[PDB]
Amino acid sequence: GKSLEEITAMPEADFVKMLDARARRSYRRSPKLKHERLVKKLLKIKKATKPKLVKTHCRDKIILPNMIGSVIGVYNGKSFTTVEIKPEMLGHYLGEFSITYKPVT
Amino acid sequence: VKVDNHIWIY
Amino acid sequence: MRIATKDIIAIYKQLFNDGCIVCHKDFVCLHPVFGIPNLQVFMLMKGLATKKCVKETCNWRCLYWT
Amino acid sequence: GSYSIYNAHPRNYGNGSRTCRKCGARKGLIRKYGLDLCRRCFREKAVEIGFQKLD
Amino acid sequence: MHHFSNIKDVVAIDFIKAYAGKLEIPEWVDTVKTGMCKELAPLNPDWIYIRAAAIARKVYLNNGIGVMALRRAYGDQYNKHYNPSHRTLGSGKVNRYILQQLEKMGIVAKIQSGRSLTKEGRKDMDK
Amino acid sequence: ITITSTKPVRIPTKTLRITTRKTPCGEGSKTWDHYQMRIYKRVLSM
Amino acid sequence: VCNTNLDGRRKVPYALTGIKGCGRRYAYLVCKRAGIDVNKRAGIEKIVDILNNPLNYKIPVWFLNRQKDNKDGKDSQLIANAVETRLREDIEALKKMRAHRGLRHYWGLRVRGQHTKTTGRRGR
Amino acid sequence: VQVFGKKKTAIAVCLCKEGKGMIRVNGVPLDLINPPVLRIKVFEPLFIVGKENYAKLDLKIRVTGGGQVAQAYAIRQAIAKALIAYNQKFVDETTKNELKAKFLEYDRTLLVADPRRCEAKKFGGPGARAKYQKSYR
Amino acid sequence: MFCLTKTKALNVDVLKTNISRKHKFVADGVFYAELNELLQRELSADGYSGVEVRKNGSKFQIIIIELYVEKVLARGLCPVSQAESIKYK
Amino acid sequence: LFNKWSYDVTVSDISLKELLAINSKLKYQVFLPHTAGRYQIKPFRKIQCPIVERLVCCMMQHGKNSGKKLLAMRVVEESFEIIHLLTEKNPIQVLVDAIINASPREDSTRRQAVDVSPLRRINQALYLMTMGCRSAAFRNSKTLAECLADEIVNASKSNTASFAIKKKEDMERVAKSNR
RNA sequence: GCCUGACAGAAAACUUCUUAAAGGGACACAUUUCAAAAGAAAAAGGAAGCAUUCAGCAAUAACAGGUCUGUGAUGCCCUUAGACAUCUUGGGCCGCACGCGCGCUACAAUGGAGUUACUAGAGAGUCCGAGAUUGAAAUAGUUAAGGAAAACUCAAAAGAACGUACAUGACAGGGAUAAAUGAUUGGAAUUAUUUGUUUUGAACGAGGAAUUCCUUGUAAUAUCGAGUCAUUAACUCGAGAUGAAUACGUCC
Known part of the structure; x- marks a missing residue:
């Protein structure tokens, strides 16, 4: 919607006000302990450092500016697909960027 | 003859 | 197995006092009376049947000892 | 622990x-009338329960 | 023969049309269809006044009635997909607006069991 | 005084209908045994 | 009328459906707001602006094609030949991020995740 | 004297008494029936024996089942039966006998209910007799 | 510590204070089957040959809370006891 | 038939006079083509049905219109007024003579040319003139009422433009070579 | 008490319709014809005359038919602490170059779309089925008596009536495909659970060889309840709504 420089510093609580209906409803419910244990690692690795690759099965996480530039591995069925978060692939679900099957042959 | 809502026959 | 130290005496008392202890085959819930999972109750005393202390009649997904 | 993650x-x-x-x-549970008796089992005890084959 | 004692001695459709400035027009008279099954808005601009008279008649015959007992009355069938058609409640805001507006006119009331007619309301339609 | 049994104001009976597949598996033709049992209610008032 | 040619035989509410952004329910609203009789046959400058500038012409935001538009702006602005171009930039956006919904669009499969084993039998 | 007309499920309970030739069904005149194509059908007993028989009779008929056509066939039954019962309880039986002969000569169903009723769906088919298609190959 | 919070009750549905009339006979009928198969594996050497669950208004009378035993005079005519004898032999 | 048409009509050929219920008894002059009798429980019980009643029920085919008597009778009731307009005679009379003229007299069996029973003459006559109205009112501006009306008046006297007459002489001509 | 016999709030009795117990009621007897007889057929009466109709049980003997993936029913084999036992996270049985079966919806004017009055039967309800009040465009969000139920909830659509509308036009029949955005159920909706609003507007013009079901409230047409269920029917099990034709026949 608005400019990136005006969207990455404003708190993400007000960011989800204009997000998707599913994305603004999942945020309404209490944060998952597994989701909260991710954001602790995502900011921890960023400050130490191209950010280091982290691995997780939390393909349910809504993309938020707190992981705006991290490197996240996502378990499809057998391995962790490395994705580098970009502003253009926002609150769409974190699992949509990892196929779980061979498409067709 | 008759004029109902289905036909107009005259 | 490694059941609570004090509870082993507690579970034995009910059998001694009454002569019949009833446990369910559902191993995910808790014993309504003892407040402990049904797994421990059957786990400890399934070796009692080897020592011929009780019998091993099972009926309708319930385990019986006498 | 050993059983901390269990179930x-x-x-x-x-x-x-x-x-x-x-x-x-785990399949075919007849939750009608609170029987909680799955099929292939209610048929055996329906006569005992009180159910009879009428029309 | 034919004798008149109440409004059950005339046809329903012609009486409703004959019964159609207190009923002020709301802001959603044009951008609203009379339900959820329907796919087109009402055609005639006077559709409220036909609906307003009809809702009054329903209260007349059925004393204890509610809004949700009017949503089912003015319902239709869901024939928008390949699934077989099933009934679905009509729109609520359009239906309850007339009843609230009829409350101020003194025709209907708010009894403990829904809505009912008043002294002047019964007299007004009979004339 | 109200009495109900599986075998005076005579309340209409409420038959309890339950239908099941005869087979214990999927094989064979589809045959259903229509199981039922009524409930009779009587009311006594004095 | 909005860089489009319409048939002059049908009624006005049912002749405006030829516009790629105006359909059946939308057409009936703009005929009421513009104060033109619905029963009149199609066979004018007041219509081409309410289609493209409907916010100030007594229209609700839930009666809009493009709600919560990106790249700034909150109006529909889709009742034109803008329908195809606006649709395209959404499709190509998903491919750029390699999102799964975009990946299926690239292969031309069933986007909304349906059983394609049996139905959808276009032999290729 | 109270009579009844019967159909599949529709029931037309009447109340025959002296009146002014007025017939109301559930509070509305018989001339204002909902399916107007059956306006003549429910009036068949009136013209069969003449309206002078019904000139001094009042009827209060309630319908509590069936459909739009099941009720219409019950209305004609309760009308014809009511005249028979009134002519039996009070008027001489000779006068009723000639009236019943004309009624039964035209339509037997006017004075007796149809015994036909819906059947019961059975397993392995959509209706009472029809069954599901068989796929040999 | 076990991460188990579910608890399955050791109760019978006939004991409910208020219950639907449709459910009462069904719940009682199910209790008949469970009790009958309870002593099935217990009175195998005894030949239970039947159970009766008559009630005296407030107390449940169990015939083979308390227990009663009646020795059937027609031992031969009972198939349940006879089937045990065939199994024994 | 609807307090408009009388039943003072005759039948041309005696071959159908005893098999058509027109005015023989008092049960056939019926106020509506809506009678809920049991005309198919014993053989030759359908002859006791009124002629227009049988004609009405034949307009209830092709699936989507099954079991809709009220919709079917409306087509007939508003058609017998059209037949009177185009013939100034009794619409019942027009139907009666149309049945006789459109009735086939010889068919073939798998071929051997065989005659047709008088009831099958009536049964096939109705099945013919309704098919023409059903097909000619499909995807057409013209309504079914006139479509049924024009077929009966055309098939009435001698016209070969009607579907019924074409088929009536189609089988006879085929049976003319199947002697 | 209100109104031009209707309606509203307390009452006092009756059982034809309602419910449900018992008995009665048809046995083809009564006539005619046909076959010394078992019996067959018509018409009248009868609420009911094909065993009155539809259903449940349903013998002797057999399949080397399906289920040991229903069980604390089990034989024998096999794995048995790095496991084929058990549990946790994620993925799948939903994947498409195609072929087959059971079905749903359409190819319309006997129709679609817009307004109105309507008419059922049979189920189900303990935190469960949810009346009433409101804000709203709908999905749905806030407060909520009654009901363990002939008590309260649980309510019809096919069809009809109303208009100078639609008029043979892949059109306003058809609603697949998608693009937007809003919530419901769930620890969790992405490979959309379900669903609302606007837009997108495809094949399908009555279907080749073959093949399935059906004889009376039957076929067919459209709908409702329940099973499954935290949420999801185009499936199954049932119920009523309207009510065709053709036969009372033969082994092709």
């Missing part, structure tokens, strides 16, 4: 929660 998944909705009273089969 940690909450099963409250129910397909693997509700079981047959005697058979224990």
